[PDB]
Design a protein around this ligand. Structure first.
Ligand code: G1P
Ligand code: G1P
Ligand code: CL
Ligand code: CL
Ligand code: CL
Ligand code: CL
Lengths: 908, 905
């Protein structure tokens, strides 16, 4: 069987875990230690691309490399034995039905491997976690227990294989760079500090030190060390059967030894020990990365002294419990509520790993992309709202004056990097996500004033959305847009938003939809920059323009403001205010955009125009209406079989991608999602889209595919079609897009369809027989039902947000709290209750929905709402109940405040 | 217990070979299949940086990765068993004293792993080689033998783990790129053809196909396949304990199956077989790389049909025997004579591997560097002369009009590439080696006319020896030096040579020796381009100038010609012909060089001057004499203990590198070698140098170190000092430099000292207990006595050349054959003979030296010489006996012609 949850805090257990390929669990802290641990203690440990403590790995390494973390016991009358089962002898029992009993347990945020040797009568339990302290450190505790009837004599040896340099050195100059190693032994362990680093940064002095240290439970140091890998393993040996352990050799080194020029292993030999029947002995090992030589005394006192491991583990458990208790779901699906706690962890992991340094994520180098700056705000708005305002303001510094944006993110707040040499890529969807995220912030917080903050615009060598290079640019002008007088231009946050959505409107292909450029959301649609079109994201931009129009009008009626400060050159793009052009003409839209580019390159005038907020809203509505009409009139398609949906793409030959085709209908999920979400699709078109999706995309084994099968490579569209069908962006169940589809369905009132979609993701993810993953939502479910690219996927943010804001219906409306449950009957528990604890206006609320009548969605309404005891007026704007912000703000800061919403049946 | 030679052809055997870490053996062909094989059949298989059939590896992989080539037998009553010992079960016996008996045998050019299972009564023998056909293919034959008293029932499964893409994908996008895999099964095996390649070339369509195919001895196809790696190994399995084999599962796939998106393994399941007591069964596996889908029928007919393996192996043995029989040594040291046969193989390997794609050589990408263009000619002149003239002419196309040279070598003959990635590096020694190699060609061949062939000069954005960028440069100027009128300038080969040696003469540092620039021979001396000086290579350039002077004079007296065609601008550099400058002035030498650079940048005039050959020789001699005087007067140094030698370097602070120092004397071998070789060092200075070398550099465990210990990193000198002492260019016994030291000693008559040096390299290399290498000379012997960077080192070329041309003394003199033995008494065999078979003027000669008087070197002379029977005039008393080229050319083409040289007191 799969894993089974234990207790009510999200802890789980998996029996015989190493009977599954490619499993791994994450251990990480804010300080920057990033680890992965497999059932046999393989994985990796790193603090960045250039500073790997253990060897860099991909998926195949987890079986093929012998260099796991290990801890050995030489058992008298038996021999060498690995506490995680990673020895030649133990591995040779796999598939013979003579395997030792074993298990993984894990929680927030820690991991435990158990193993039993019935022959010798020994049990081992090895706990890994990364402390929540300001050090880059991983700790290991091995506890050995004599489960037999007589004394055992054991000789323990810890062994953490070291790498201690850049992943650039994996093979390229791998051996040469081993010659730069300097190993220093001391009382508690082994430090490795290369003299130099050779990697893509060049040849440089290194001070970075990688440390492996250990002690018995009582604080007693190791008896000695085998710091040199080839000496530890022996001539013709290996890390899963090393001579030093197998032949029980005396230590090569004591404290104060230096050794130069060899690959290193943190091999710590402990004193031999006699273990009474029933009694235990424990060992603590620490793996440390530091910017210089390590104060080994301080680390020994903080991590290896008696009871430090146990105390730090409690500290770790409490810190993570505190992070995750910001969102708690409670329903008739107890297994799913606890599964969602792991989903709730994932957005934090993506931040702390920088979408990198786990075995599948083998290409990542730790940075953040443009999308992450926005996506990371979604989890934060729900879990840690305080930080979000600062992050959004800074993010808008990266926008260029042509609507595009910096694609390389820097160290500082609002720091972005120019790449003046590389042939650079524009993703056409990059302008769409900021508004969506910002709108969410406005509705949760009520902070409408954010839209009128000043901010600069990014500027580098690339202009006209990276079509041309600029001649008159030097390093002396700096990375910000200048005025005629040479000053840094600043526009409203709103001016930035306008620009990001208006520019794409005019940037149309030969079929009238917005150009694909380098790709949209789908990174694999990278081969149609000349003639490609993302109809899919045209519906997103159309919807954004309409929301912008509604937003401006609502700013007038709430703020009172009549005016918008916008740069004079942007007035060209708001042509409804001057001499309107025909939006039916492609030539005219292109020409007007070329005029705009010329007006703002290399500099702007600096002069701003002050425009009527209602007249600007009218321009935005006109554009939106045009796009809505064109999409419905020109990109609504039907197969001969009678299904109908929206074409999502035109390829680099100007050909429509979707519809009937030799070898089968071509359809994409991406082409439907934003049409539905934003209102381009009518209700009738949404019913039809769902049927076409269910017909062409919904697989009975793997769920809602990102696209149907296109035969072979598609070199006029994208490299994604080089992937085998059902993998990555070619037809896998790609969680992010699928969650957004569900989100869109819920938004539009298609609740049963939306539920089916969300429930599919959970069922696939948790069907361990096929998925072979721990709790969490993967990036994708593949052709064989396996969970791929675990933990770091952005889909988790959306899953969390969709459950909170759509399914349980707890969301903001200009800072006021709206309650609009879209829960189905089957989600209510044995007392007809389903609840969510969440943060809103700086207070923890337990929103409990009571459905005593057991009504299905559509058959229920809100009958009453009581807040912490007393009654509440729900001044109901539309289909749900609306509570004013002040009533929540008036609550006590401490404690969880209960808000009981009673549901009853409809009339008539 | 090391390896032991067997027979007289250089075949060897090693018992319990996998009791040694990091061992590997090379298998390679001209077609481009490049392989390495370890005692457990690990290593790698590739046709280039971007086309790896098996996973790319470094040293640590050879133990740490489970993905060796493998062949499994599921033995009834026993279970899974690897014919090479690479299974979890078999590995778990290591260090328990329950290991199975095993062995490697190898020869030219093939490899054999044997193993015995005493429990089951089964012996396996697995032979690997690369055929000498026009395909990129490696073959494996596994022969299983029942050594027990009752029948065995066996189920065989071959398993070659596939990678099938660029080494760029090793980790970076490793998994993503697995999704591009397309696996096709057919009757005889498995093809992998990725739909696309993602690597440093970009995202592209791929057609390259990687194939694993197999058959029984009779040509019977496999019963089926497990083409998908994760299915073959099983959930929680591994390539050294795969479920498909361990649980004896039925095949996943038959012929005609396609599978997309997974890592692949060439896992071929053969029919179960009952093996009688005493009898054998064999299997042939073929690993193929092709530019498109493979014609599997043709490969099956050519490689898998009955008796094809055995026939192709004979063909391989004969081809290599024929390549290596061009040089054969025979002496009182039989083990060394056979060891040298392996040394003789190495230059061919360096060419065919492009100094890459063996486990230690983990940074190489298959290309050639500037030095290789010259070094590769040394082995060729002795083993395959025909190609050499063309290679030299083409090589000179790479020289720039400032004496520097292109550093990136291209596809075509004489094609050189301009560096698109900024970052230009000049190695100051690059101008020195061409003359040394060319002179050797002139003396072996007699083809003095080569020096007057026309050739272009390379041109790119970088000028003044890559100090400045050129303003008036576009793609529009092209890759060749233009004249004022816009034509491609062509100069004599000799004009190129002059320029390469004269420019460095003026390119001096603040201490008056030639600037280090980006590094010299030592690639690790890369941190003193501003103020560094290579005194070491100043002695080389000084010697080159003198040889050039002697050469020009000898051209007059042999060709008859009195003139040299040289570009007018080069006359500035031959200042003795116009207004001489003072060579004692650094400022004046620098200024004259800056004038020259200005005269030739961006273009030359095209007009040539015709200069007196004797007056040019006079200019060259003047320079040489100046450099010889300055080095002896200013760079001869002494420690307080009283040892004396030549300072080799100034560092980037303008400080002298060598001499007394806190924590110990600093001395380099490189600073001595060319001083000795070229005559800068007098005989007395050479005696003293050898004593200082022996005192400071000669380690009793590891031999002649490249340098003594400098404490810690040396950031004003080179990155080499970041290496642990005794590794790579920081104080290891670095074979190339050590061989050249020996060469220099022999050249100067220090024969006992030279012998000690050459014998040290052999003894260290062959002391397997410490060296842990197969026969051959390594790049270096390290601090623990281990042989490192095997096979591909350029030291082998020099070792071969030094044994032939100095030790046995068989060398050219303007095409005439000179015999000048420098053999010591102990090298003569039991009949007082030592001999060498070698190619000269297109004929195989067996030069046999007879020393009946048992005289030591220095006490013997040449008393008579007979050629195939009749007597020979030796037109020369002094140093050696000199035989005219015609007498050799008059011999029959076929056959080995004996030339008996009798030595007396
Ligand atoms: O892993 P994730 O976040 O689910 O999704 C990943 O692939 C998507 C499709 O190419 C991109 O839009 C995301 O930026 C990327 O992180
Ligand atoms: O491996 P090899 O050829 O013995 O020697 C290697 O290192 C030397 C010292 O840096 C260089 O001069 C050679 O060009 C290089 O190939
Ligand atoms: Cl056992
Ligand atoms: Cl990155
Ligand atoms: Cl056994
Ligand atoms: Cl290369």
């Amino acid at each position: 069987k799969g894993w089974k949850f234990q207790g009510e805090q999200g802890e789980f257990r998996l029996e015989q875990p190493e009977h599954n390929s490619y499993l791994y669990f994450p251990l990480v802290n804010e300080a920057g230690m990033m680890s992965a641990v497999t059932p046999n203690l393989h994985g990796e440990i790193t603090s960045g691309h250039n500073t790997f403590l253990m060897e860099p790995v991909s998926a195949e390494s987890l079986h093929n490399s012998k260099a796991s973390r290990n801890f050995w016991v030489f058992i008298e009358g038996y021999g060498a034995w690995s506490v995680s089962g990673n020895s030649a002898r133990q591995n040779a029992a796999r598939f013979t039905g003579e395997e030792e009993r074993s298990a993984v347990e894990a929680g927030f945020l820690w991991h435990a491997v158990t193993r039993e040797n019935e022959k010798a009568g020994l049990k081992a339990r090895t706990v890994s976690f990364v402390p929540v302290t300001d050090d880059k450190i991983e700790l290991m505790r091995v506890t050995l227990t004599n489960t037999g009837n007589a004394p055992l004599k054991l000789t323990p040896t810890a062994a953490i294989p070291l790498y201690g340099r850049s992943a650039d050195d994996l093979r390229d100059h791998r051996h040469v760079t081993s010659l730069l190693h300097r190993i220093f032994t001391s009382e508690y362990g082994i430090e490795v500090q290369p003299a130099l680093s050779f990697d893509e940064r060049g040849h440089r002095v290194n001070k970075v030190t990688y440390g492996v240290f250990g002690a018995e439970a009582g604080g007693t140091a190791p008896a000695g060390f085998f710091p040199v890998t080839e000496d530890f393993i022996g001539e013709g040996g290996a890390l899963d059967w090393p001579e030093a352990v197998v032949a029980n050799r005396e230590p090569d080194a004591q404290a104060g030894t230096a050794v130069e020029g060899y690959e290193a292993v943190g091999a710590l030999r402990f004193a031999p020990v006699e273990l009474a029947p029933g009694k235990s002995v424990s060992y603590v090992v620490a793996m440390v990365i530091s910017g210089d030589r390590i104060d080994v005394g301080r680390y020994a006192a903080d991590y290896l002294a008696a009871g430090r491991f146990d105390a730090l583990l409690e500290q770790n458990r409490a810190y993570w419990r505190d992070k995750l208790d910001t969102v708690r779901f409670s329903s008739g699906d107890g297994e799913q509520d606890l599964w969602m706690k792991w989903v709730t962890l994932q957005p934090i992991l993506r931040r702390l790993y920088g979408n990198s340094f786990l075995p599948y994520h083998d290409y990542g180098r730790g940075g953040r992309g443009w999308r992450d700056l926005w996506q990371d705000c979604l989890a934060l708005m729900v879990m840690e709202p305080a930080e979000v305002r600062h992050l959004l303001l800074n993010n808008y510094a990266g926008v260029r004056m042509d609507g595009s944006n910096a694609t390389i993110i820097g160290a500082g707040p609002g720091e972005f990097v120019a790449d003046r040499n590389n042939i650079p890529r524009v993703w056409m969807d990059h302008g769409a996500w900021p508004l969506m995220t910002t709108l969410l912030y406005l509705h949760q917080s009520g902070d409408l004033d954010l839209l009128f903050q000043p901010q600069s615009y990014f500027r580098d060598v690339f202009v006209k959305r990276c079509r041309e290079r600029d001649a008159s640019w030097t390093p002396e002008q700096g990375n910000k847009l200048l005025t005629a007088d040479g000053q840094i231009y600043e526009g409203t946050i709103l001016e930035h938003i306008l620009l990001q959505n208006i520019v794409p409107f005019f940037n149309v292909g030969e079929h009238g939809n917005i150009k694909l450029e380098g790709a949209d959301w789908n990174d694999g649609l990278d081969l149609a920059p000349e003639r490609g079109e993302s109809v899919a994201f045209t519906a997103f931009y159309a919807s954004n323009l309409m929301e912008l129009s509604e937003l401006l009008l609502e700013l007038q009626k709430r703020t009172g403001k009549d005016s918008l400060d916008i740069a004079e050159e942007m007035a060209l793009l708001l042509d409804t205010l001057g001499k309107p052009i025909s939006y039916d003409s492609i030539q005219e839209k292109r020409s007007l955009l070329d005029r705009y580019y010329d007006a703002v390159t290399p500099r702007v005038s600096g002069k701003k125009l002050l425009l009527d907020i209602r007249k600007v809203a009218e321009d935005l509505k006109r554009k939106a209406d045009w796009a809505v009409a064109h999409l419905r009139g020109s990109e609504w398609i039907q197969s001969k079989e009678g299904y109908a949906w929206f074409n999502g793409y035109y390829n680099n030959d100007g050909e429509r991608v979707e519809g009937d085709h030799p070898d089968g209908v071509r359809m994409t999920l991406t082409g439907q999602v934003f049409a539905i979400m934003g209102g381009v699709a009518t209700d009738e078109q949404t019913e039809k889209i769902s049927q076409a999706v269910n017909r062409y995309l919904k697989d009975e084994r793997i769920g809602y595919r990102l696209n149907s099968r296109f035969g072979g490579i598609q070199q006029n569209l994208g490299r994604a079609f080089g992937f085998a069908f059902g993998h990555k962006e070619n037809g896998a169940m790609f969680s992010h897009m699928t969650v957004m589809y569900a989100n869109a369905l819920y938004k539009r009132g298609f609740v049963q369809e939306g539920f089916e979609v969300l429930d599919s993701i959970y069922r696939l993810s948790a069907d361990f027989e096929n998925s072979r993953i721990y709790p969490g939502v993967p990036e994708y479910i593949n052709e064989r039902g396996r969970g791929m690219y675990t933990y770091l996927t952005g889909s988790a943010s959306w899953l969390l947000l969709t459950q909170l804001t759509e399914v349980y219906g707890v969301k903001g409306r200009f800072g006021d709290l709206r309650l609009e449950p879209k829960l189905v009957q089957a989600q209510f528990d044995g007392s007809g209750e389903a609840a969510v604890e969440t943060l809103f206006a700086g207070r923890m609320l337990r929103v409990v929905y009571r459905n005593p009548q057991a009504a299905e969605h559509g058959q229920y309404r809100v009958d009453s709402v009581s807040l912490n005891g007393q009654s509440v007026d729900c001044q109901n704007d539309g289909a749900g109940c609306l509570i004013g912000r002040s009533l929540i703000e008036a609550l006590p800061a401490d404690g969880v405040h209960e808000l009981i919403v009673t549901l009853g049946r409809n009339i008539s």
